[PDB]
Amino acid sequence: SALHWRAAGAATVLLVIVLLAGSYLAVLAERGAPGAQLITYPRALWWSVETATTVGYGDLAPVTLWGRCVAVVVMVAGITSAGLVTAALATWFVGREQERRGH
């Protein structure tokens, strides 16, 4: 298939992997830090999603160095995914407008 759609689907798959891996690693990094709340997996998965989408309610946040590094990877995976999809959409619309005008 076309490259922009392959890249978008790839990025969605990788994003799902980053969300799951980041949830696991966030708990691993944050347990052992007194006061940390990112310490059970279901709510860590929720936190990783609202971090990837850049919503960040602030109901949960990492306090350790490694938990925050994981957060940064999650943010960047989410923003990159969303950028990839926007660009793929733009590419589709541009090509269909080229055809509709007769190139």
Epitope: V27, R31, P34, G35, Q37, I39, Y41
Partner: antibody, heavy 118, light 108 residues
Framework: QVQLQQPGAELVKPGASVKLSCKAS????????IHWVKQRPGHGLEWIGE????????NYNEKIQKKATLTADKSSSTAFMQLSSLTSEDSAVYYC???????????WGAGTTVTVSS | DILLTQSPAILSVSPGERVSFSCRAS??????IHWYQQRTNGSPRLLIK???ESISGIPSRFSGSGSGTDFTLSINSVESEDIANYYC?????????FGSGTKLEIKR
């Protein structure tokens, strides 16, 4: 099928050390944590520490003097707690417990009664 | 660290009455409180998770309520086998902590 198997008793000379075991069966996940809880006779439950066998990382109760070292053998599904240089204040039942990463102790071992005496 | 206060330490009831155990957290912890029963020479047994959620195999006369800082374990119509110590435990912040326990005693 007992999910967590612990020896009934350990006798330890004052100053000596002992390795408690906790053999796990049943469903095992990468999100499992094994916890260790100390109970002095007639007293409450004191959290000692935890280990995630899928990764080998262990954390310890900071409020108490560190007498424990937690390890886990993934091939024999066994968690260990090495207690070192014990005194009579270390005489207690020590439980292991399995937490599926969601915060509560779904199942407990039967406890190992450790007596520190000569 | 989250301090969990269980008071009173001893509860005295009559057979078949409703009993309520109190557990108070030193700061707000949502519903992240779990309740265990420990009989004489027995190991603890989970009764209620996340403040109010049932556990399979636990009699239905056990229930829990509350959120924030104030939690209650309830027994509808207590009977002899409920004689035990009862502990709450929080999982909202590291480290997990336990309350100091309430003993149930029955006046027969």
């Amino acid at each position: 099928q007992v999910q967590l198997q612990q020896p009934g008793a350990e006798l330890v000379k004052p100053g000596a050390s002992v390795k408690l075991s906790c053999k796990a069966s049943g469903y095992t996940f990468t999100s499992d944590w094994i916890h260790w809880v100390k109970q002095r006779p007639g007293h409450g439950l004191e959290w000692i520490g935890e280990i995630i066998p899928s990764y080998g990382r262990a954390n310890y109760n900071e409020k108490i003097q560190k007498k424990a070292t937690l390890t886990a053998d993934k091939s024999s599904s066994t968690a260990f707690m090495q207690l070192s240089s014990l005194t009579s204040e270390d005489s207690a039942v020590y439980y292991c417990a399995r937490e599926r990463g969601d915060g509560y102790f779904a199942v407990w071992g039967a406890g190992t009664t450790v007596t520190v005496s000569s | 660290d989250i301090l969990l206060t269980q008071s009173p330490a001893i509860l005295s009831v009559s057979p078949g009455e409703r009993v309520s155990f109190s557990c108070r957290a030193s700061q707000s912890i949502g519903t992240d409180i779990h309740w265990y029963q420990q009989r004489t020479n027995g190991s603890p047994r989970l009764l209620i998770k996340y403040a109010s959620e049932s556990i399979s195999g636990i009699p239905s006369r056990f229930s829990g309520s509350g959120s924030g800082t104030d939690f209650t374990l309830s027994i509808n119509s207590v009977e002899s086998e409920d004689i035990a110590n009862y502990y709450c435990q929080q999982s909202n912040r590291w480290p997990f902590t336990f309350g100091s326990g309430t003993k149930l005693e029955i006046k027969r």
